[PDB]
UniProtKB/TrEMBL annotation, chain C:
Residues of the full protein shown: 45 to 139 of 139
GO biological process: photosynthesis
Source organism of the structure: Physcomitrium patens
Subcellular location: Plastid, Chloroplast thylakoid membrane
Name of this protein: Photosystem I reaction center subunit VI, chloroplastic
Highest taxon above the source species: Eukaryota
Chain segments annotated as coiled-coil in the UniProt record: none
From TrEMBL, chain D:
Protein name: Photosystem I reaction center subunit VIII
Transmembrane segments: 6-30
Described function: May help in the organization of the PsaL subunit.
GO cellular component, one term: photosystem I
Organism: Physcomitrium patens
Keywords for this protein: Chloroplast, Membrane, Photosynthesis, Photosystem I, Plastid, Thylakoid, Transmembrane, Transmembrane helix
Keyword Chaperone recorded: no
Bilayer topology term: Single-pass membrane protein
NCBIfam families found in the cross-reference section: PRK11877.1, PS_I_psaI
From TrEMBL, chain F:
Source domain of life: Eukaryota
Subcellular location, record wording: Membrane
The name this protein goes by in its record: Uncharacterized protein
Function recorded in the entry: Stabilizes the interaction between PsaC and the PSI core, assists the docking of the ferredoxin to PSI and interacts with ferredoxin-NADP oxidoreductase.
Protein family (similarity comment): Belongs to the PsaE family.
Shown stretch of the complete protein: 68 to 131 of 132
Coiled-coil annotated spans: none
UniProtKB/TrEMBL annotation, chain H:
Superkingdom of origin organism: Eukaryota
Record membrane topology: Peripheral membrane protein
Natural source organism: Physcomitrium patens
Parent-protein start and end of this portion: 69 to 210 of 210
Described purpose of this protein according to its UniProt entry: PsaD can form complexes with ferredoxin and ferredoxin-oxidoreductase in photosystem I (PS I) reaction center. PSAD may encode the ferredoxin-docking protein.
Family, similarity comment: Belongs to the PsaD family.
GO cellular component terms, A-Z: chloroplast thylakoid membrane; photosystem I; photosystem I reaction center
GO molecular function: protein domain specific binding
A Gene Ontology BP annotation from the UniProt entry: photosynthesis
Localization per record: Plastid, Chloroplast thylakoid membrane
Protein keywords: Photosynthesis, Photosystem I, Thylakoid
The keyword Isomerase appears for this protein: no
Protein name from the UniProt record: Photosystem I reaction center subunit II, chloroplastic
């Protein structure tokens, strides 16, 4: 499906996980920020490409990036 | 009067006043100095 | 069970669970009695698919339309009737 | 025109038959699963 | 607690449908169940023959009364040939649809479960050879229906109000 | 210490930042070993998302 | 003067050969 | 954490039917099943359009998309304070536990979770597409 | 219990919040970080629901805003009456209404615009007005400019009164929520006291003022020596010599011998031959009857004296097997949501305005209105556009209610829930009917185009070809033409001269009305109208029904009512919000109303409007080419758009040159809208970044950061400019054409 990437600029605010409508992102332990956590995308095959996770990231430029592509059945959001 | 003067100093009110004054000036100038294509000098 | 209670999910009956029903699919086998002629006369189409039926259709459409367009008379088709009045002639004397 | 029947032949083909064959072949091709 | 005519599809509220008088009235359901398309036990060839006969027979009329030669003496022949050509084109449509949709040697994927849950046999119309037989029967029946309509209308000249 | 002093005016060297070649005020610097972007910078003007603060490493901030 | 039917059929044959070569080039571009 | 199994004896909510529901996709490709526990009979809004009463106890609802499952679950969590979990069901009878992969919701950080897709550099430090010409890989994949 | 409930001094009258622009909302009260804030300040000013969740405060704001609108309308009407009093030739038009063009606007001699002061007649120069105010004042019995002056002064007084009422009911004595929720009392008062009493009062005016003055005017009496209305009221012998039944003097009213009032309470129908308008006796009887009907109907609902109807009990009692609880929960919807009421009232007002447009040309209610073709066309087009806009607004506010005010808990198995539950079937069938109508109307037009271009006129759809006669409309006209004979025996004439009978009213040398014939062209154009209306309804109803959720975005209610999209995922979610559905329904309403007004204009200029000679030969403005030219799209392009636009483009150097100027300017505004409609937002944001660099190089960059318009704002600007340009182009074209040919 689409490709979702997380960068070291993340601050572990979890706001991208809460905005995801298909449960693609999750928070994992990390040691590069004060929050001691970082976002991750273990199940991007369920990603639809809404980039709501991108709109919720507060860093200057996005620590979470969605690149789109493939456009499989789950990606197109088809119920038929 | 502080609040009234502040409101009158807002962008739209001041724009209305300034542009109305400019339009009146131009209209009166054209009343007394109309239909000129060349600046006489 | 699908209908024992208000449950509508059952792995043992997935067709019922997913709604894969046939609403009007009557399976009564006794419809016609005399149908030997229809089986006999239809051999070019049945069990042919891409080989015979498609080629026959292409040939019998191409030849049919070619014959119709080549053998049509003037009255039926106006393009083959041809002009009948004098040329109308164009402006500036150009013809 | 040397052959007046030749337009009446060719125009129907390239107009109806050639599109029919072309679109049938392309529909069969783009619907293959392989 | 009232009568509540309208019901969900087979009692399942989570299937995308409804039970309406238009859908499953005893008369409407009986009518739809006995249409040749829904007679699954009957061979596809005969169902196709019936469908093509009906469709060519009904198609002859519009071409005859609306065609470009409707004011000429070949009006009937022109309309009948137009109906036959439409039947042939639709035969090519059916053939290519069967080629694209069905592969030889595969089982039918048509619903094999009734509303009650009898779990009948799957309809063979949704198969490569089933669809091929259906297409052949439809071609034969369409040509036959066009011929019959032309014969009744013009060769025999039965009295009809509009023609 | 790690980076600039608290309250100091720093200029951003991040090319992808909305505030490249812009001045901000340092709010806090974290001394935890492992933090990659510990310097917190407040800016007078917001970015497109509406955020007026960010985190930078000391190597992409210069003193005025 | 006007072209003859022999010329017409020569042109048709030449076009048919060019079509064969075109189909060949298309098959060569395909793979 | 041992994933729970999908029970087939869980009653469904009181719903009167809708045109927004399972379609041919549910029977040829896949569908989803959400389960939650409720303390009382209350009215909620179906994600497909409409209203229903949830049972005073276990519930079992079939959906066509994962996004609808998340929408209903989010409403349940932030409105009725109800824990939920859903599964992906295939036509062959395969059931896959989906949302709490480890039993903890993704918003809360949990140990034992692996970092997938995490890049150890800034977003602006990506390689240029020109350097990766004729190589079947992307700049963000490095 | 229905009682008066207010709060004393809820809001202090102070200018403190005037200095704070975005005080009404928490987000905008901080300040302008970006330029978007300014636009937001103007986009959330009247969204009172977004300001707070308190329904009482929202109701108070709505009441006071309505008072402000009433004051504005009073100012506007007072201005019209003032301009009739001073800058008008109303009295000259009274002396000769058939040869003097109405005019009530005079330009100043500044930049050569004085050419716009055309020779309208009566020793006057000014802009020729088409609002119909002259005919309305003629009907009201106004004969002097002093009466217009006193009306204007009263209008200013009433505007000040409404302004004070708004101030008083917001800042001094603000009604509580219980007061607003008394819907039964409100309906009783607005039916008996507003509509019924207003109709009764206007009937009184007509009986005592309009009828005598207008019948003296019809007799040829110079308006100067026509006695004043108070002389008719006081000297009742002067009124009785015009209508003898006044000598009876209210005895027939109370003895129930009402037939003795047949002198001035008639049921004639048709048109007055002298003026071409409706008989004012018929109008007076009409207004009296509807006043009685409304006063009776306003005694239906139970306020606090028992005897009446509870609308909640009426609604809850109406349910059936095909529905669930039926009309259960709708009382709470309509007594707790302002947006639902606004949707219903907007839809009804738009449909009512369309009815007004259709009924005011078939029965011209004012003297010398039918023969004033410019006024007729302007009134029809104006009220058509107003109605269309109101209907689209009703759709918008229905969507807003569905998004924000809808509560699933209190709406279970009722009508709204069940409509939401089979929206797929509704939209499927509406889409099918839209496609079918589009094909079998516009494809018929294209068929006609092709056969006309192929030299096969016998294969077309026309009267000399395959005919599609509107037999049902023709039968309805036939039935209405014979109504006085058998079905309404107490009628002299039919409802309108448009039904039939061979009667032609020709005031002066023009034609007022005549039997309108319907043929293949009318069949085609009505089916085009049906197609456009169904497509607009499709767009709007699909927006309303899918506002909360859909198979694409199941949580669209959380996104809101006015949002751009949900992202490029699921293939792209552009314009999924109900606001965008309204945005497209505006375009489709534009097309529908445009085709409707074009059909009206061509049909009237072709078959109805014209001049009659002394012998009796009736010639038409266009020449009756609608029956054979409207069947072809080329016919519309040539015989209507090209032929009838010859006057707007040749109007330069004359008093109609302003119409040509605005014709071209409206074209410009439409083309300008095209880029807000076609372009995006990232492109303009990057261009703005480059411009901001240019400004920063010179230390002139503003602290309020320039931003491109939002996506929703881009769409709003595009649609606003598009509609303005199109509607103004048509306005200029019609006005120039109909002033030239009339
Ligand atoms: C690209 C060049 C070209 C074009 C646009 C046309 C166009 C036309 N031709 Mg002509 N023709 C051409 C070349 C061309 N011809 C050549 C080279 C020959 C010599 C064999 C002919 C011989 C010919 C005859 C004998 C007749 C026409 C006729 C016609 C008309 C109907 C179409 C038809 O029956 O085609 C038939 C065309 C052929 C049999 C020639 C083969 C096709 C040529 C070689 C072009 C194919 C490749 C070309 C690049 C298209 C690529 C497809 C797409 C990617 C664009 C139409 C006006 C008919 C007419 O006059 O009706 C009034 C007719 O009877 N054509
Ligand atoms: C550019 C190619 C092209 C050509 C050559 C034609 C040719 C024709 N069209 Mg046109 N048509 C075209 C494109 C074309 N069409 C397109 C693109 C459209 C859609 C806008 C139409 C829409 C159209 C309409 C709506 C009508 C025509 C009709 C006709 C026929 C004229 C009347 C006639 O022959 O007498 C009367 C006809 C006959 C005596 C015989 C017609 C029946 C023969 C047997 C057809 C051949 C069938 C054959 C088995 C299959 C061959 C094709 C297959 C391989 C795909 C003529 C055959 C008229 C007609 O009669 O329709 C049938 C008519 O009403 N056409
Ligand atoms: C001079 C008397 C006066 C004073 C001092 C106030 C003071 C106040 N009012 Mg009150 N009010 C008054 C008269 C007054 N009002 C009257 C007469 C009405 C009846 C209409 C109201 C109705 C009213 C409501 C309903 C509300 C207020 C509110 C407010 C507060 C903020 C208003 C503000 O800043 O917006 C200033 C806004 C403007 C100056 C815009 C004026 C727009 C006018 C009315 C329409 C003009 C239309 C124009 C002709 C056409 C434009 C287009 C044209 C150019 C082409 C403030 C306490 C609000 C409040 O308390 O906030 C919670 C609130 O909700 N007032
Ligand atoms: C509400 C509807 C309405 C409309 C659309 C108009 C429109 C018009 N009126 Mg009418 N009018 C109305 C209501 C209306 N009026 C009412 C209710 C009254 C009764 C008070 C009048 C009384 C009236 C008179 C007595 C006259 C007009 C005139 C005019 C015309 C010129 C306007 C003018 O002089 O402004 C000029 C512009 C200004 C006054 C603005 C000055 C302020 C600006 C901002 C500059 C200030 C700069 C600086 C601060 C000082 C214009 C066609 C005039 C006309 O037609 O003459 C032939 C004219 O003489 N009107
Ligand atoms: C932007 C809004 C707008 C504008 C500028 C106009 C402008 C105009 N209208 Mg239109 N109109 C509108 C909206 C608008 N209208 C709407 C929404 C309706 C539907 C209610 C109407 C219905 C209407 C009628 C029926 C008439 C006009 C007339 C006029 C002209 C004004 C002459 C006058 O003062 O007579 C003022 C109007 C009258 C004296 C007669 C009105 C009689 C109605 C039945 C009374 C209204 C009842 C009630 C208050 C409305 C709500 C009903 C609802 C509760 C069921 C002028 C062209 C008149 C005209 O064309 O004169 C030449 C005319 O007869 N309009
Ligand atoms: C016979 C009683 C009566 C009458 C005549 C009206 C008349 C009106 N009401 Mg209603 N109303 C009534 C009783 C009445 N109301 C009751 C009992 C309630 C409480 C349940 C309401 C609650 C109510 C609301 C909530 C609203 C109205 C609105 C309106 C106005 C709509 C605009 C319009 O078309 O008016 C056409 C007619 C005119 C414009 C003429 C000018 C108005 C004259 C002066 C009549 C005013 C009558 C008034 C009710 C008498 C009390 C005031 C007195 C103390 C001076 C209209 C003037 C709406 C409005 O616009 O508010 C301003 C609105 O939002 N009314
Ligand atoms: C609200 C509307 C209204 C008003 C205020 C009046 C007011 C008046 N009418 Mg009128 N009248 C009206 C409607 C109205 N009328 C209608 C609708 C009719 C038709 C039934 C009449 C028919 C009528 C007659 C026949 C007479 C009056 C008379 C009168 C006057 C004396 C009676 C009275 O109550 O005072 C008075 C000026 C009387 C009059 O003019 O005496 C001087 C008189 O003889 N009226
Ligand atoms: C009784 C009539 C009525 C009433 C009371 C309202 C009231 C409201 N509407 Mg509704 N609406 C109506 C009719 C009505 N509308 C109609 C007829 C339409 C169809 C066009 C709509 C379409 C509509 C939409 C699509 C939306 C609203 C919104 C709103 C809210 C206003 C918030 C806002 O931004 O406004 C502030 C005022 C403006 C933005 C107006 C600015 C000026 C406009 C855009 C252009 C003026 C054109 C002008 C005539 C051009 C010529 C002059 C020019 C040369 C200077 C408020 C609840 C909004 C809302 O509630 O959002 C949640 C919203 O999104 N309405
Ligand atoms: C002239 C320009 C134009 C045309 C033709 C259309 C056509 C259509 N629009 Mg679009 N639309 C347009 C401009 C146009 N729109 C613009 C500018 C806007 C912006 C506001 C929209 C916004 C819009 C929306 C929001 C919606 C539509 C809808 C529709 C459909 C109407 C119903 C239908 O499908 O059957 C009628 C179809 C036609 C009239 C198309 C022409 C068909 C002709 C008559 C026959 C030609 C066929 C012929 C045999 C040739 C065959 C070709 C073959 C040889 C290849 C149709 C697809 C609605 C829809 O989806 O349908 C319900 C819908 O919801 N449109
Ligand atoms: C052919 C369909 C004819 C419907 C004729 C008809 O008007 O049916 C009327 C039908 C009868 O319901 P009842 O009127 O008994 O329900 C009581 C109502 O008073 C509650 O609103 O209403 C419906 O079922 C919903 C609309 C039908 C679906 C409309 C599709 C068109």
């Amino acid at each position: 499906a689409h490709s979702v990437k997380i960068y070291d600029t993340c601050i572990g605010c979890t706001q991208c996980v809460r905005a995801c409508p298909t449960d693609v992102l999750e928070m994992v332990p990390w040691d590069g920020c004060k929050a001691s956590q970082i976002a991750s995308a273990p199940r991007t095959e369920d990603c639809v490409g809404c980039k709501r996770c991108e709109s919720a990231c507060p860093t200057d430029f996005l620590s979470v990036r969605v690149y789109l592509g493939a456009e499989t059945t789950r990606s197109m959001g088809l119920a038929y | 009067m502080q609040d009234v003067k502040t409101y009158l100093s807002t962008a739209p009110v001041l724009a209305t006043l300034w542009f109305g004054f400019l339009a009146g000036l131009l209209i009166e100038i054209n009343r007394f100095f109309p239909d000129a294509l060349v600046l006489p000098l | 069970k699908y209908g024992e209670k208000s449950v509508y999910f059952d792995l043992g009956e997935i067709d019922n669970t997913t709604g894969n029903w046939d609403l009007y699919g009557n399976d009564d086998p006794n419809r016609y009695n005399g149908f030997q002629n229809k089986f006999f006369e239809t051999f070019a189409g049945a069990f042919t698919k891409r080989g015979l039926l498609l080629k026959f259709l292409v040939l019998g459409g191409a030849t049919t339309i070619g014959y119709l367009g080549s053998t049509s008379s003037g009255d039926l088709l106006a393009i083959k009737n041809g002009p009948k009045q004098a040329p109308i002639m164009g402006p500036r004397g150009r013809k | 025109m040397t052959a007046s029947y030749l337009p009446s032949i060719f125009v129907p083909l390239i107009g109806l038959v050639f599109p029919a064959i072309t679109m049938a072949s392309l529909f069969i091709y783009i619907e293959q699963d392989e | 607690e009232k009568y509540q005519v309208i019901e969900p599809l087979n009692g399942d509220p989570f299937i995308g449908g409804f039970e309406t008088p238009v859908t499953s009235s005893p008369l409407i359901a009986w009518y739809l169940s006995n249409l040749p398309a829904y007679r699954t036990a009957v061979a596809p060839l005969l169902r196709g023959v019936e469908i093509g006969l009906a469709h060519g027979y009904l198609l002859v009329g519009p071409f005859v009364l609306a065609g470009p030669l409707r004011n000429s003496a070949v009006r009937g022949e022109a309309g009948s040939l137009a109906a036959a050509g439409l039947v042939t084109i639709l035969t090519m449509c059916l053939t290519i649809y069967g080629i694209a949709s069905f592969k030889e040697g595969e089982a039918s994927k048509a619903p094999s479960l009734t509303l009650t849950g009898r779990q009948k046999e799957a309809d063979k119309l949704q198969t490569a050879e089933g669809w091929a037989s259906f297409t052949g029967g439809w071609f034969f029946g369409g040509l036959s229906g066009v011929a019959w309509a032309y014969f009744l209308l013009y060769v025999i000249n039965l009295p009809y109000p509009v023609k | 210490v790690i980076g600039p002093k608290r309250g100091s005016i720093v200029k951003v060297l991040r090319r992808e930042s909305y505030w490249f070649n812009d001045t901000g005020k340092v709010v806090a610097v974290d001394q935890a070993p492992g933090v990659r972007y510990p310097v917190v910078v407040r800016f007078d003007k917001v970015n497109y998302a509406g955020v007026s603060t960010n985190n930078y490493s000391p190597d992409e901030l210069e003193q005025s | 003067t006007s072209i003859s039917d022999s010329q017409i059929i020569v042109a048709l044959v030449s076009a048919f050969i060019t079509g064969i070569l075109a189909l060949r080039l298309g098959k060569s571009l395909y793979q | 954490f041992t994933p729970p199994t999908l029970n087939a004896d869980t009653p469904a909510p009181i719903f009167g039917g809708s045109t927004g529901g399972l379609l041919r996709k549910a029977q040829v490709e896949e569908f989803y099943v959400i389960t939650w526990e409720s303390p009382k009979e209350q009215i909620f809004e179906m994600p497909t359009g409409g209203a229903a009463i949830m049972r005073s106890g276990p519930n079992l609802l079939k959906l066509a998309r994962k996004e609808q499952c998340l929408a209903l679950g989010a409403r349940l969590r932030t409105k009725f304070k109800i824990q939920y979990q859903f599964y992906r069901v295939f036509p062959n009878g395969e059931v896959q536990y989906l949302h709490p992969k480890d039993g903890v919701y993704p918003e809360k950080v949990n140990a034992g979770r692996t970092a997938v897709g995490v890049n150890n550099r800034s977003i602006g430090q990506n390689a240029n597409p020109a350097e990766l010409k004729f190589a079947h890989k992307q700049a963000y994949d490095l | 219990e229905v009682k008066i409930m207010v709060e004393k001094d809820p809001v202090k009258t102070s200018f403190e919040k005037w200095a704070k622009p975005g005080h009404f909302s928490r987000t905008l009260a901080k300040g302008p970080n970006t330029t978007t804030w300014i636009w937001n300040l103007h986009a959330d000013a009247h969204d009172f629901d977004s300001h707070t969740n308190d329904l009482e405060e929202i109701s108070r704001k709505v009441f006071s805003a309505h008072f402000g609108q009433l004051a504005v309308i009073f100012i506007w009407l007072s201005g019209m009456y003032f301009h009739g009093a001073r800058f008008s030739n109303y009295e000259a038009w009274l002396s000769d209404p058939t040869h003097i063009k109405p005019s009530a606007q005079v330009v100043w001699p500044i930049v050569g615009q004085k050419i716009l002061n055309g020779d309208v007649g009566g020793g006057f120069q000014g802009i020729q007005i088409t609002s119909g105010f002259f005919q309305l004042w003629r009907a009201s019995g106004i004969t002097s400019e002093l009466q217009l002056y006193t009306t204007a002064i009263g209008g200013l007084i009433f505007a000040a009164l409404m302004l004070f009422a708004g101030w008083f009911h917001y800042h001094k004595a603000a009604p509580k929520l219980a007061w607003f929720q008394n819907v039964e009392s409100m309906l009783n008062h607005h039916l008996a006291g507003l509509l019924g009493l207003g109709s009764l009062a206007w009937a009184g005016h007509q009986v005592h003022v309009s009828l005598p003055i207008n019948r003296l005017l019809d007799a040829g009496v110079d308006p100067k020596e026509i006695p004043l209305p108070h002389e008719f009221i006081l000297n009742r012998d002067l009124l009785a010599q015009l209508y003898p039944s006044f000598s009876k003097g209210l005895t027939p009213f109370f003895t129930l011998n009402w037939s003795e009032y047949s002198d001035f309470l008639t049921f004639r129908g048709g048109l007055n031959p002298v003026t071409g308008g409706l008989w004012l006796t018929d109008t007076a009887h009409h207004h009296l009857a509807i006043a009685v009907l409304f006063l009776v109907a306003g005694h239906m609902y139970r306020t606090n004296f028992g005897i009446g109807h509870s609308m909640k009990e009426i609604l809850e009692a109406h349910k059936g097997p095909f529905t669930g609880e039926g009309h259960k929960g709708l009382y709470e919807i309509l007594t707790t949501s302002w947006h639902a009421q606004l949707a219903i009232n907007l839809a009804m007002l738009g449909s009512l305005t369309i009815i007004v447009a259709h009924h005011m040309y078939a029965m011209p209610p004012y003297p010398y209105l039918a023969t004033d073709y410019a006024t007729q066309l302007s009134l029809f087009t104006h009220h058509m556009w107003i109605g269309g806009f109101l209907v689209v607004g009703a759709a918008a506010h229905a969507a807003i209610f569905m998004v924000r005010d809808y509560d699933p808990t209190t709406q279970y198995n009722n009508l709204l829930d069940r409509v939401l539950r089979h929206r797929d079937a509704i939209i499927s069938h509406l889409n099918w009917v839209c496609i079918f109508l589009g094909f079998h109307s516009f494809g018929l037009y294209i068929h006609n185009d092709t056969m006309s271009a192929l030299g096969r006129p016998q294969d077309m759809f026309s009267d000399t070809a395959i005919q599609l006669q509107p037999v049902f409309a023709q039968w309805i006209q036939n039935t209405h033409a014979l109504a006085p004979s058998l079905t309404a025996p107490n009628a002299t004439a039919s409802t309108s001269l448009t039904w039939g009978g061979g009667d032609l009213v020709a005031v002066g040398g023009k034609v007022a009305l005549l039997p309108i014939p319907l043929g293949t062209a009318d069949f085609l154009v009505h089916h085009i109208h049906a197609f456009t209306i169904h497509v607009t309804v499709l767009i709007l109803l699909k927006g309303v029904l899918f506002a909360r959720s859909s198979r694409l975005i199941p949580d669209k209610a959380n996104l809101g009512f006015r949002f751009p999209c949900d992202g490029p995922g699921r293939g792209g979610t552009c314009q999924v919000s109900a606001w965008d559905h309204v945005f497209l329904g505006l375009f489709w309403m534009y097309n529908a109303i445009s085709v409707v007004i074009f059909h009206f204009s061509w049909k009237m200029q072709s078959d109805v409007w014209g001049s009659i000679s002394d012998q009796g030969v009736v010639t038409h403005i266009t020449g009756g080419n609608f029956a054979q030219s409207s069947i072809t799209i080329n016919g519309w392009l040539r015989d209507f758009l090209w032929a009838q636009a010859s006057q707007v483009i040749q109007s330069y150097g004359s008093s109609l040159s302003a119409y040509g100027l605005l014709f071209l300017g409206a074209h410009f505004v439409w083309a300008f809208s095209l880029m807000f409609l076609f372009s995006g937002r990232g492109y303009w944001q990057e261009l703005i970044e480059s411009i901001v660099w240019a400004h920063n190089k010179l230390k002139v960059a503003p602290a309020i950061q320039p931003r491109a318009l939002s996506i929703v704002q881009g769409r709003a600007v595009g649609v606003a400019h598009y509609l303005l340009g199109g509607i103004a182009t048509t306005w200029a074209f019609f006005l120039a054409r109909i002033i030239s040919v009339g």
